[PDB]
């Protein structure tokens, strides 16, 4: 038996999260774009952190970050 109406929502699971949580603000940044460098969308935080790292900008990773 199949539903007539909609009651399941077909959705794509290819994602490895909707969101990345900021290191202070936890707030659901978007992660989209072929770069590496992640930014706090949070209107008030514009902070920057190293996509992989969730933390600060490492200076350790500088360099290896930011782009991949
Ligand atoms: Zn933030
Ligand atoms: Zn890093």
């Given at each position: 038996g199949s539903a007539e109406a909609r009651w399941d929502e077909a959705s794509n699971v290819t994602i490895?999260?909707?969101?990345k949580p900021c290191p202070k603000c936890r707030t659901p940044t978007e992660?989209?774009?072929?770069?590496?460098?992640?930014?706090?969308?949070?209107?008030?935080?514009?902070?920057?952190?190293?996509?992989?790292?969730?933390?600060?900008?490492?200076?350790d990773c500088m360099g290896a970050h930011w782009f991949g």
């Open positions: 490895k999260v909707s969101t992660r989209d774009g072929g770069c590496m460098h992640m930014v706090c969308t949070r209107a008030g935080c514009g902070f920057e952190w190293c996509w992989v790292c969730q933390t600060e900008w490492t200076r």
